[PDB]
Design a protein around this ligand. Structure first.
Ligand SMILES: [Cu+]
Lengths: 72, 73
């Protein structure tokens, strides 16, 4: 797997956040999906078949704002 | 073509950070959507637009929240 980590500025509470992990871990290359609730970091781990640019359009279509914190 | 239609969706929504996410997704469509208005207690979302109905259902499906109903008016 590679890895990506992104600042998801709309993360504050708990009940909004699993709408990320539920969707991402349904994609046929995602290996793991972590999140941090005070620092707004989201840390996703995946094989192949998608770009950080494609992920930014998916997670912005989840109704967030995200900027790619690292590609690692 | 270009005549405004009215749509209303009932959607499962816990937080003000749920309606504030729906608002952030639908903001991208204001060039062809003329009004957006959410009622959290009524669990519903009102839309007025020239965009095709199934494209809004699919932007809701990418927002990821579960849908109780959708209709045109
Ligand atoms: Cu929430």
């Amino acid at each position: 797997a590679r890895e990506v980590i992104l600042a998801v500025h709309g993360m504050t509470c708990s009940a909004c956040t699993n709408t990320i992990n539920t969707q991402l871990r349904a994609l046929k290359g995602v290996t793991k999906c972590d999140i941090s609730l005070v620092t707004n970091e989201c840390q996703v781990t995946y094989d192949n078949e998608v770009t950080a640019d494609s992920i930014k359009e998916i997670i912005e279509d989840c109704g967030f704002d995200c900027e790619i914190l690292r590609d690692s | 073509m270009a005549e405004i239609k009215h749509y209303q969706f009932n959607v499962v929504m816990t937080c003000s950070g749920c309606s504030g996410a729906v608002n952030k997704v639908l903001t991208k469509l204001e060039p062809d959507v003329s009004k957006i208005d959410i009622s959290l207690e009524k669990q519903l979302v009102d839309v007025y637009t020239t965009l095709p109905y199934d494209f809004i259902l699919e932007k809701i499906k990418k927002t990821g929240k579960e849908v109780r109903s959708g209709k045109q008016l």
